[PDB]
Amino acid sequence: KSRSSRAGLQFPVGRVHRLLRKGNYAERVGAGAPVYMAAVLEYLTAEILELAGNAARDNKKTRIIPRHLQLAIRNDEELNKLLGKVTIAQGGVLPNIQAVLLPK
Amino acid sequence: AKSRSSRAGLQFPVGRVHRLLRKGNYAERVGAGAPVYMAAVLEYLTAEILELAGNAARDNKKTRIIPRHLQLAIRNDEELNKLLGKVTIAQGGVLPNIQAVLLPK
Amino acid sequence: RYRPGTVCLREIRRYQKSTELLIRKLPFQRLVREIAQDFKTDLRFQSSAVMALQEASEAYLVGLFEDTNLAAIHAKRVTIMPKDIQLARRIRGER
Amino acid sequence: HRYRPGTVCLREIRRYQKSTELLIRKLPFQRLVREIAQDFKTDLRFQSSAVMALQEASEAYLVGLFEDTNLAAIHAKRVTIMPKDIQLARRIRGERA
Amino acid sequence: KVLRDNIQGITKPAIRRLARRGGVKRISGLIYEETRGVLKVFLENVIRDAVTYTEHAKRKTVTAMDVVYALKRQGRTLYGFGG
Amino acid sequence: NIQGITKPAIRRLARRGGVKRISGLIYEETRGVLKVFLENVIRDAVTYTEHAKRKTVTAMDVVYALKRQGRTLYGFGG
Amino acid sequence: ERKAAERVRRLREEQQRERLRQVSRILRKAAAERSAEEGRLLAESADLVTELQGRSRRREGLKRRQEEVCDDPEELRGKVRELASAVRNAKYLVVYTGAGISTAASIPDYDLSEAEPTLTHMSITRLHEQKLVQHVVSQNCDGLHLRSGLPRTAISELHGNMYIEVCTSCVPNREYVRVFDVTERTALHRHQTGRTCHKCGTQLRDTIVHFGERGTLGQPLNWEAATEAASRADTILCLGSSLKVLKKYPRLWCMTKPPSRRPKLYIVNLQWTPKDDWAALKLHGKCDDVMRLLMAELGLEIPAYSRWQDPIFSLATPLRAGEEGSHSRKSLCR
Amino acid sequence: KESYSIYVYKVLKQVHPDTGISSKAMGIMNSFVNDIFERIAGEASRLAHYNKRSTITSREIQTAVRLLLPGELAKHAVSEGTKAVTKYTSAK
Amino acid sequence: SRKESYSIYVYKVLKQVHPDTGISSKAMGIMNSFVNDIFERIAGEASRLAHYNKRSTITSREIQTAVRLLLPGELAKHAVSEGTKAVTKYTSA
DNA sequence: AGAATCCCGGTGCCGAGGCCGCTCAATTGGTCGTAGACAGCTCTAGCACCGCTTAAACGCACGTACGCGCTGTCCCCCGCGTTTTAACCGCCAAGGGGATTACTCCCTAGTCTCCAGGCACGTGTCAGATATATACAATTTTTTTTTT
DNA sequence: AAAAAAAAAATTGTATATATCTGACACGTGCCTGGAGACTAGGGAGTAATCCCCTTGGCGGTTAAAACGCGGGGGACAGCGCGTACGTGCGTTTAAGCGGTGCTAGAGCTGTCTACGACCAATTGAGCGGCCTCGGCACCGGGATTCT
């Protein structure tokens, strides 16, 4: 009967409610705003984990590594735009060889 | 002395900055000496920028400072450039510079 | 007739000393109205916003201009080529 | 035999873009971190976590600088890097005014 | 009236003047269209952020304040227009 | 003391960047730039240190320093 | 260094600026108007007023260069006697027509058809029939020297003769003459007479060259012919020249060859020019009067110009059909 | 210390039941979730300041979601959030 | 309604530095933007670091640290000294 | 033919997901002070149009300086071998400082009352535009002279 | 006889002095709202004590890593020839820009009244700390395929 359950969402909302109230963001907090924040959170987590799992399966691996999430965050343009200035731990770089440097 | 600015010998307001601090949603309670520090650092920054602006003004035989003059002042200071090399000034232009390789030989 | 380049540097310094605005207001205003009408129809703009857009666009374009100038002079060239702007934009962090 | 110059370069490029291990030896790094930090005040203590954070942050930022310089070099119609490429990178990214 | 054919409203001498302010001595013949494209993409970005800031306040008129908030949102704070 | 970064290490970290050829005047400028960025980050971290009345700097302080420069790093309690 | 150090050396720069501005202020006002105690800084800075007087005197000297200078008629006629000896003794000689001769012939100083050859052109032509003068280089673009009777090979014009037009199509090129001036049809940046050749049938190109374009035809006017004529001369002469047009092209003088090896050069002009002081013999006077007096020592009468006697009209080819309405200025009649 | 480990794990099991995950990648996930938290809440805060309002609601944060995130992603997020808040308000 | 600005105070400091210098309106706009921008910046890192060390109060120390954060070496050395003498002058009376 | 890399199998080993237990935090419930949703009135700025004077854009052609390709040179890193060396692991000791708990002083918030500093407004007068008419150092290019 | 250097003059922007006027900056004023003076209360912060986690330090092995030398080959760089694309100037066309003139959608403020969010006592379960057990993955090695 939790608010996460009556909302159908997974991440906590009362936790979000408190950390909004103690966040020094406003003297008052709305009611459905943390439900929104949790929903968009589950979204972004869902697609990042989707593409991370695609990367893991592409390497014939059943577990995740920072390398796979790096590949996932680099291959797609939208998440690259979002994760522009962010440097990832143990991620590496996309393999790329420039054309005229290759032998003829 | 009644005004707090005159009490500390500062020329920016203490009540106004204190009110901005309280009505800023930064902390639920505020100390007493913070506005004095704020006014002091504001004095220092505004004074140092206006000094070089006036220097630029008397450089070109002009008695009135213009944001072009402030642009000249801000682009020729090593540290203040690190302060605000990030910002953009209105109708400020650019300092003249030509690469030596571009000059005729 | 002056040798080729003296007029170039003349214009360089003439507009380096200048502080005014270098794009005609009516065409760029028409452009901003056209590009903005794609998001919500029957928009109304005020003058302050359009001169703000003036100044911001001019500042960016000037900045990327000396950036490409540096890129081109690094290429032992005096001519600027599109590869210069593609490099400048790639390495600045956009795209 | 003797490989033509470049085959080993491509091999090492492939192996190092397939690896995620830290690249520089740790003890010289702790030495340099201590010997740059002690100048502001004396008698400091450090933990391993901060040191590795500094290590991998520096490694990422530097490798980024290097693809930047590589683009500058290939645009320069060259296959060899020179200091002026790094100077141009510091010009573009704006950290150096 | 619907607006079309206005990216060409920025003229070749204007771009030449802007390049001269940039400190450039020679201009290639293939620069103008790509400068136009860069200007188009940056304008679309700034107008999108500004217009979103505009309907956020339930307003039907764009504000220069919205423009300022957007421009410092792209980390391009601009001086002398309030704020 | 700055010579502690060996030439082979610089060569390898240039390899990871995709470089094939290295000049003879690269190492000193690499050392200088690393020195200056390290001194920036350590200044920020040490200031964060004396603020809160502790004699030892923690890793999360380094995380604060790097996130201030828009260089956020993951996997260390961020 | 220290920001206090920044302030202090800014202050010393300021005191340098104020002392320079106040020395300038003390310099500006005249000594007579100012008080005795004032100007002591100016008095000790006597070098400053020295270069101030130098500036004043050099502007005055430039003004004297522009303004016309006269010499005494008797010293003029003596120097012209020496000039007559020099022109008689030389087997080959070159004379340079000048812009003073242009002003005498109403040609602007540095229409054209209505202008007639001046009496100076008469005297130069007379020298040519006497063969004392072998070659002449003309500043003026009028072609009035050709009207005077000058042999076309003997006269070389760097601007070009307005009446003559030379086709650019043919490699040897085709030479035609038209009495009327063609500046009305011709314009800057375009080099076409618009008159088809009677034989070739291609549009002619006027021998005159405008300002801002280069003539690519050597037949209308031959540079190396003028250089060789200058070299062959035992001595070089110029008369009534502001010289600026001849200053434009050095080769026609052959100034390139060393002053010692070249034939000695003398220039006569009412207006001052650098070649005037460069010349060993200098004469200040009106060019027409000087040439008349030179003819007087030579004992040979000055010729009288006549349209029938002017060669250009007969050298002129008949005008193409329909070209009469094309030109704004009417064709000359002999 | 507080972390979102269990909730993220529920998201995994609802999307990928047959998948195993380490702890480091979880640290990256926690840092990522916190980061978008500060971005979204902070820009909502400047929105509340800008319009001279003192109450935080769903409107400023939904506009923020439109603001920082690309078109397809933005429309998906706003649609899901509206359906979630409507479901929340439906049951009391 | 009424609008708040810094015109009188900055004009006073103009007199204190330069008694015989004028001013323009665009100059007032740009300096007002400067004072605002620096104010929210400094208060921003102050609030962040006050949250950071789990303290609910803000004083001279956190803002002194913030000044030494964003301001380069010599400028910061001057700013800390001026602020200290100012605060001791205020608290002494 | 040949070294370098992908692929399959076997074995060991420590982290990952479960399970147990407990405690602070999420949830109910009610209640009271308070912000904004809505209507309405108002006043102001953006839009649209018109006419006109004029400065800029354009099209063109001509020339020439530059980008580019090619050739020759020389030269300086690369790959491999061999000697050198310090990094890393594992282990063991010791002291400091980070963290927690308890406690008492005192500094900000809050409220009321009263006054003076800043703001909107108005008017004078003077610094800078604006046109007009000029000086002026730098430079640069050409000529002339000197040296080999 | 030819090349290089110095001087002088002519350009070339480059800077300038000055008469008129005009609109914008500076100064005077009423007042009203925020800032200042005084008192109270209460929770947050400064200070003392403890410990045990952790950081610093030392030492022996060994072992991969680093350092140096040398032959050589590909790459950088300079020079030359040539085609052309772009600078530059002039005649022509166009639309930007200023000045009124008018309208109206639309921002801003005012009033209220109700719905919504803060506060606090009870209370109960979901989340966090410890321990485990065992399987997914690393490691050494053998073989399968792949550029040179």
Author numbering:
A (entry chain C): 15 to 118
B (entry chain G): 14 to 118
C (entry chain A): 40 to 134
D (entry chain E): 39 to 135
E (entry chain B): 20 to 102
F (entry chain F): 25 to 102
G (entry chain K): 10 to 119, 139 to 362
H (entry chain D): 34 to 125
Task: Show passages lifted from the paper.
SIRT7 is an NAD+-dependent deacylase often deregulated in cancer, which deacetylates either H3 lysine 36 (H3K36) or H3K18 with high specificity within nucleosomes. The catalytic domain binds at the H3-tail exit site, engaging both DNA gyres of the nucleosome. Contacting H3K36 versus H3K18 requires a change in binding pose, and results in structural changes in both SIRT7 and the nucleosome.
To evaluate how SIRT7 contacts its substrates at H3K18 and to compare target-lysine specific binding modes, we next reconstituted a SIRT7 complex with a H3K18DTU-modified nucleosome for analysis by cryo-EM. However, while the mechanism-based cross-link performed equally well as compared to the H3K36MTU, the SIRT7:H3K18DTU-nucleosome complex required further stabilization by gradient fixation in order to obtain density in the cryo-EM maps. This suggests that SIRT7 binding is more dynamic when bound to H3K18 than to H3K36. Notably, the catalytic domain adopts a distinct conformation when bound to H3K18, indicating that movement within this domain is necessary for H3K18 targeting. In concert with this reorientation of SIRT7, the linker DNA contacting the catalytic domain is bent inwards towards the face of the nucleosome by 6° relative to its position in the H3K36-bound structure. These changes in distance reveal weakened electrostatic interactions at the SIRT7-DNA interface when targeting H3K18, possibly accounting for the less defined cryo-EM density and indicating increased flexibility compared to the H3K36-bound map. In consequence, we did not model the H3 tail or the ADPr-DTU cross-link. The shift of the catalytic domain further alters the overall conformation of the nucleosome-binding domain and, in particular, changes the bending angle of helix α2 by 30°, which in this case is more similar to the published partial crystal structure of the SIRT7 N-terminus.
